Amino acid sequence: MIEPSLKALASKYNCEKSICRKCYARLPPRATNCRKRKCGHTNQLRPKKKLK
Amino acid sequence: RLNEYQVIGRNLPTESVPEPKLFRMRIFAPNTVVAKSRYWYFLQKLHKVKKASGEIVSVNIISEAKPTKVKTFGIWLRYESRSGIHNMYKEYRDVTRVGAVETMYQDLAARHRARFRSIHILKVVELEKTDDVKRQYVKQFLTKDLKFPLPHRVQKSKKLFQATAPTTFY
Amino acid sequence: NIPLDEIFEIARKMQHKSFGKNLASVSKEILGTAQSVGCRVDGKNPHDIIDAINAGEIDVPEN
Amino acid sequence: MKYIQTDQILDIPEGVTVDIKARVVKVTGPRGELTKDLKHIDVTFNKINNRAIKITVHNGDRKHVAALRTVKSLIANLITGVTKGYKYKMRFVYAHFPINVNIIKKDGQDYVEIRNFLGEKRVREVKIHEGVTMEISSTQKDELIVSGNSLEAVSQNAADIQQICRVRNKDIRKFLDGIYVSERGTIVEE
Amino acid sequence: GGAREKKVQYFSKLRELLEEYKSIFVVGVDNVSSQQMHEIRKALRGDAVVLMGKNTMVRRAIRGFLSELPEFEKLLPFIKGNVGFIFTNGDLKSIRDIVVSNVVAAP
RNA sequence: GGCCAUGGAAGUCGGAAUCCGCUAAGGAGUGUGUAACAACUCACCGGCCGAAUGAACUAGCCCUGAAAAUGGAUGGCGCUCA
Ligand SMILES: [Mg+2]
Ligand SMILES: [Mg+2]
Ligand SMILES: [Mg+2]
Ligand SMILES: [Mg+2]
Ligand SMILES: [Mg+2]
Ligand SMILES: [Mg+2]
Ligand SMILES: [Mg+2]
Ligand SMILES: [Mg+2]
Ligand SMILES: [Mg+2]
Ligand SMILES: [Mg+2]
Ligand SMILES: [Mg+2]
Ligand SMILES: [Zn+2]
Secondary structure, X not given: OOOHHHHHHXXXXXOOOEEEOOOOOEEOOOOOXXXXXXXXXXXXXXXXXXXX | OOEEEEEEEEEOOOOOXXXXXXEEEEEEEOOHHHHHHHHHHHHOOOOOOOOOOEEEEXXXXXXXXXXXXXXXXXXXXXXXXXXXXXXXXXXXEEOOHHHHHHHHHHHHHHHHOOOHHHEEEEEEEEOOOHHHOOOHHHHOOOOOOOOOOOOOOOOOOOOOOOOOOOOOOO | OOOOOOHHHXXXXXXXXXXXXXXXXXXXXHHHHHOOXXXXXXXXXXXXXXXXXXXXXXXXXXX | OOEEEEEEEEEOOOXXXXXXXXXXXXXXXXXXXXXXXXXXXXXXXXEOOOOXXXXXXXXXXXXXXXXXXXXXXXXXXXXXXXXXXXXXXXXEEOOXXXXXXXXXXEOOEEEEEEEOHHHOOOOEEEEOOOOEEEEEOOOOOOEEEEXXXXXXXXXXXXXXXXXXXOOOOOOOOOOOOEEEEEEEEOOOOO | OHHHHXXXXXXXXXXXXXXXXXXXXXXXXXXXXXXXXXXXXXXOXXXXXXOOOOOHHHHHHHHOOOOOOOOOHHHHHHOOOOEOOOEEOOOOOHHHHHXXXXXXXXX
């Protein structure tokens, strides 16, 4: 088991991201556009879904 | 290569109206044949007159008042794009009113693909006050004590081959 | 339906609540919080008969 | 728009001597010297005084102006690397399998050796970059201290260690195991 | 439009309380909670009024109006940082008994 | 610890509500965290620096949209302040 202090540190790299809706890119949460050229730097983003 | 012309015309006098009002336009044209043509183009955009029913009264070149005084010009435009019709305002630095309009025509061709046929010049005004300058790309030349180098000078050679290593100082 | 002239009593029995301006502000706290229930508050819902004396309707400047 | 001129001001602390010649910056401080070649950028330098340096771009477009404050920030990072140092602290994050981390030396090279990561029999080795110091923290359980003068080398070795510990074929939202950078600071605390 | 009206009411209630009472001294705080501030004014019903707001608005909205109430002038350079106001008039001791009363501390 | 739902839900499961009072400041709450609170984070207002900033729209070039079968055609070479 991972202590809550370390689980937030790990979630910063694994969970706290946004995902491009057309090409599936792992983006920073605050990003307004995707960094990939293949999708045309689209603004259609959505947060990475979480376990529940 | 353009000139600024004063073109004055009127409707042909009738026994009903023997002295119709005289209307003048300032036309930026390469020569007097296009200056009088452009005049009728704009009168038929505004007044009920034609070339067949009208008369050109005077065509005169308007020379720059201070052709060796550096000015900043604001030009008000109305141009047609591929999709619609737009109003625009741009600024140019030059010593003659004509040379600002020539820069304007080169400028809208390059950034908006607007041909000569697609542009109406609404107004050209010399901006007297430094507060009258709205655009940053010409306002940056109105700062105090302006200095700048010209790095990377390329010298044009008359010969194909040069026997010494190239340089770009200047 | 209340007051039943006792809505000031609920304000002066819960006298330790809203740190307002002058006692009558405490009555408004119960006025605002009881609106979340919704009953026969003089016929309708509060945030109305409240807002009557909030601007100044009849008369409760009780000392 | 071709901005006529854009400027940034470097600040040189008292004990530091920046030294620039043909876009080759050599920064000297109490902690040592760092050098960097900037021949891929068109910038010019003026020494305002011994404590300030002007960095100028003449008639630069949007991207070429954008490349000016990055030059400033890189030289400032060089300055603070030779006057304060850099220190990255990494925490070992595991749910079940303890991560066995040793600082080994093979073939005359320093390596960081990660074992038992998620129970794997595989032994992970990360080369330690030159100018980078590794230490196993005594004051903290499961902590690695990466320190050095150059921020670029320190952060890239730390990233190497973090990247070699990526989880495959699992739900990484659930399998949060790995080695992660927990603190980015300086050798000299401020 | 709303902000300039709320600015107008602020300077209105600033000069309403200025003439009604008088004389004020240094009144600065930090790390003070919202419930922390509700405690002082709970007991300071009418003897004192907790005038509150900010800095930059207070300075200029009074400095320009140094015509109907000049006197202050050089009094403005005092207003620095997190500073409120306790509009009252009593005595150097009679206000610190009722005001300094509540303290919240931390290590 | 608002009401009702709820084993429990106190802002952060779900429904009528969406108010009031102090405030310059604060939502019956934007999140993480709890069985639940607590906790911190935000909404908005403060202090600080001090001269600019945000939003919507238009159309130029470029990019995404743009998948077919022998190897191959702005005519070829090649060309990037052309
Ligand atoms: Mg008409
Ligand atoms: Mg131009
Ligand atoms: Mg030109
Ligand atoms: Mg141009
Ligand atoms: Mg046309
Ligand atoms: Mg030659
Ligand atoms: Mg699987
Ligand atoms: Mg565009
Ligand atoms: Mg693109
Ligand atoms: Mg294309
Ligand atoms: Mg050419
Ligand atoms: Zn994408």
